[PDB]
């Protein structure tokens, strides 16, 4: 749709100058479309990382809320939660870390 719309304007530009600029207008349409393919990859990656973290959080919280207390003892259950908390924290205390994950991460740190 974006390609059809940008090409429609590059047909609506009725002039001598626009006929001469038409190659460069298609070339700049090519960089805009490549950036938008990048934006679509970014949104699908930020979905997939977040969907995986939500699925992992769902698994951890069933191990904690629904499994019997006589299948993980009072010390190993504590070590598993102490270690998971420290690993779940460092991946969000690093400054490259995606902000879309923070509502899942703090949501896990609360249950932990």
């Amino acid at each position: 749709l974006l390609h059809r719309v940008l090409v429609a304007e590059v047909n609506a530009l009725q002039g001598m100058a626009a006929i001469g600029q038409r190659p460069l207008l298609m070339e700049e349409i090519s960089t805009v479309l490549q950036y938008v393919v990048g934006r679509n990859k970014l949104l699908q990656c930020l979905h997939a990382k977040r969907h995986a973290l939500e699925s992992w959080r769902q698994l951890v919280e069933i191990i904690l809320t629904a499994c019997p207390q006589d299948l993980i003892q009072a010390e190993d259950r504590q070590l598993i939660i102490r270690d998971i908390l420290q690993d779940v924290h460092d991946k969000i205390l690093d400054d490259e870390a995606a902000q879309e994950l923070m509502p899942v991460v703090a949501g896990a740190v609360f249950t932990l």
């Binding site: 990656c45 997939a48 995986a52 939500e54 698994l59």
Partner: protein, 670 residues
């Protein structure tokens, strides 16, 4: 021999030799100045043989030589070198307009011959008052000149089918004017076979859009189809008579097939929106009326000397309709009645041919009867597994028929909402619902069931199983229709067992995503593997969308649930156990089960990562829903141990497919 080149190899280039350097300025990637290699002795003898069999050609070798040149003109360079030979064979006869001895295998001899036949045939025209004893008119073309003209038209048509330069530098010629001479000969009383090779020569010329735009106005001006029917005129004129009075007299149809092929090129170079203006309302529909109401709706009526040609006619008309619906996108002005002044009266324009096609597919039309009773007739021949005359043309005529209905479903919602905003006083029905209309032959709703029967041929016609699975995926989106598909797919248990087989047969097929990337492979094999893979993806999407539709749904049938009980009481079992059929659940498991013994983990997680992502999603839906989960979460442990045998291979790892692997892992953790 050289007449086909299925691997593009231009091997006829040993029979050519460059007399002029090609100056193609558009490759900018090498610096090795290879100075003037001399052409090899093989090529220097062969390109000499092609020339020296032209030396003083006797009338017996003439047609063999034109056919030898037709085979050797196959390919883009082969055509340009043959065009250059036929040019050099003429460029010698200057001033000496009495010494009749130029080459009879040259462009100028051929176009002058066509102009002379046009000049003579258009002069014997019967002035009415001459009612007395004529002798036999010794001016009709004899078969030796007809079959020579056919050989030269077929040579011309091969050359211009390939070389862009050879369409332009013949149509540009101010003394050969080939479009005007050929359309002029098509108005004359010449045999329909010579008219067919003339129309094919126009169909090969009409590839260049500059030629096509002038050809559209030249066709409209020459009335070879009569678009302007005069109120005093009792007889039509043009191909609408020749089809119904000559071809429907011979039981062979070369003229109408060549006309459909001419329109089939001239749609892909597009048609002028003002086509016919001032002579009639502008637009395409007079050509669509001929192809629909005089060709297509009349292809099952006619008798045929070639039992194959009944299908050779169906291919070339459904191709034109497919192109006209492929490239048309609906717009709000299609739903506004544009008026045009014509000889002082205000008259509405002809709507787009794709709007005309949408309107004729979104109603209980004779065109939809003929489409759906072509899909029935197609399966009804194919389910014999036999060879039959014209089989490949029936398989294509089914392919274009499926692709038309699929293009309707892909554009239907937009067409139906632009009709709601414009408030135009038409009625149209969803194709999802017209496909459930009572087939007048079988007296069942079996049109969708006959679409789904192409899946039982998925190994033998993957291009029919692909469009079938994709059409069925689109129709599965309608939660209203799901409950009825379960009825029509289970009312006949013998058909239901073929439907279950066809959905499983496409999924358990072993072809991997690897073969679409390996550059060594054939185009046709790469294509067929990609078509089989899309067929799996559309079956998994059909299952995914169907599982979130309320029970009973089509996925609960295809996965093996007991839809004659409450779903949660289903006793799922392994294939063959108590006579359990193999189902899409045993296929979705097999796709993920391959490699679960291996240190490398599951095969589809590596070799089909998008197939694996969708397979884990179906298993998640079958475990998250209340009434599948009881049967499923039993079965996955009692027969496959599946959650242990898969979780041992976490995390999954490839740097290309991160998004898909995070989603595979997302569903397995869920």
């Amino acid at each position: 021999l050289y007449k086909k080149n299925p691997f593009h190899l231009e091997l006829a280039l040993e029979y050519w030799c460059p007399t002029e350097p090609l100056q193609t300025p558009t490759i900018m990637g090498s610096y090795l100045g290879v100075a003037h290699q001399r052409p090899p002795q093989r090529q220097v003898v062969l390109s000499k043989f092609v020339r020296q069999m032209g030396d003083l050609l006797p009338p017996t070798i003439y047609i063999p030589y034109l056919k030898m040149l037709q085979g050797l003109a196959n390919g883009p360079q082969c055509a340009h070198y043959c065009f250059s030979l036929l040019k050099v064979n003429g460029s010698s006869h200057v001033e000496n307009i009495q010494g009749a001895g130029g080459s009879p295998v040259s462009w100028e001899h051929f176009f002058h011959s066509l102009m002379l036949y046009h000049e003579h045939l258009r002069k014997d025209l019967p002035s009415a008052d001459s009612v007395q004893y004529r002798h036999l008119p010794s001016r009709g073309i004899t078969q030796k000149e007809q079959d020579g003209l056919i050989a030269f038209l077929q040579l011309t048509s091969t050359i211009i089918t390939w070389s862009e330069n050879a369409r332009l530098a013949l149509c540009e010629h101010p003394q050969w004017t080939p479009v005007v001479v050929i359309l002029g000969l098509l108005q004359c009383s010449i045999p329909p076979v010579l008219k067919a090779e003339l129309l094919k020569t126009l169909a090969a010329f009409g590839k260049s859009p500059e030629i096509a735009a002038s050809l559209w106005q030249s066709l409209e001006y020459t009335q070879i189809l009569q678009t302007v029917r005069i109120p005093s005129q009792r007889q039509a004129i043009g191909i609408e008579v020749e089809l119904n009075e000559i071809e429907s007299r011979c039981e062979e149809y070369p003229l109408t097939r060549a006309f459909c092929q001419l329109i089939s090129t001239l749609v892909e170079s597009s048609f002028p929106s003002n086509l016919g203006a001032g002579l009639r309302p502008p637009g395409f529909d007079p050509y669509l009326q001929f192809l629909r109401d005089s060709v297509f709706l009349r292809f099952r009526t006619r008798a045929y000397r070639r039992a194959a040609e009944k299908w050779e006619v169906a291919e070339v008309v459904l191709e034109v309709f497919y192109k006209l619906l492929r490239d048309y996108e609906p717009q709000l002005e299609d739903f506004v009645d544009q008026f045009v002044e014509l000889q002082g009266e205000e008259i509405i324009a002809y709507k787009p041919p794709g709007f005309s096609l949408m309107y004729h597919l979104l109603n209980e039309s004779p065109m939809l009867e003929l489409a759906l009773s072509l899909l029935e007739e197609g399966v009804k021949q194919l389910d014999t597994y036999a060879p039959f005359p014209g089989k490949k043309h029936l398989e294509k005529a089914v392919q274009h028929c499926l692709a038309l209905l699929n293009l309707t479903l892909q554009k239907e919602n937009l067409f139906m909402d632009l009709l709601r905003e414009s408030q135009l006083a038409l009625i149209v029905c969803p194709l999802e619902q017209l496909l459930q209309g009572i087939n007048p032959r079988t007296k069942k709703a079996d049109n969708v069931v006959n679409i789904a029967r192409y899946l039982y041929h998925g190994n033998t016609n993957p291009e029919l199983a692909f469009e079938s699975a994709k059409i069925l995926c689109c129709i599965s989106c309608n939660s209203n229709i799901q409950i009825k598909l379960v009825g029509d797919f289970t009312h006949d248990q013998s058909i239901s067992q073929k439907l279950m087989a066809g959905f499983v047969e496409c999924l358990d097929c072993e072809d991997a995503e690897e073969f679409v990337r390996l550059e060594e492979g054939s185009e046709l094999e790469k294509k067929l593997v990609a078509i089989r893979h899309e067929t799996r993806i559309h079956i998994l999407n059909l299952l995914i969308t169907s599982l979130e539709c309320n029970p009973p749904n089509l996925a609960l049938y295809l996965l093996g649930f007991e839809l004659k009980k409450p779903v949660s009481t289903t006793n799922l079992q392994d294939p063959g156990v108590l006579g359990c059929p193999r189902t899409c659940l045993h296929a979705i498991l097999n796709i993920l089960e391959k490699g679960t013994e291996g240190r490398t983990g599951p095969v589809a997680v590596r070799e089909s990562p998008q197939l694996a992502e969708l397979c884990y999603q179906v298993i998640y839906q079958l475990c998250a829903c209340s009434d599948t989960s009881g049967p499923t979460m039993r079965y996955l442990r009692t027969s496959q141990d599946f959650l242990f045998s898969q979780l041992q291979y976490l995390p999954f790892s490839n740097k290309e497919y991160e998004i898909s692997m995070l989603n595979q892992m997302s569903w397995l953790m869920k």
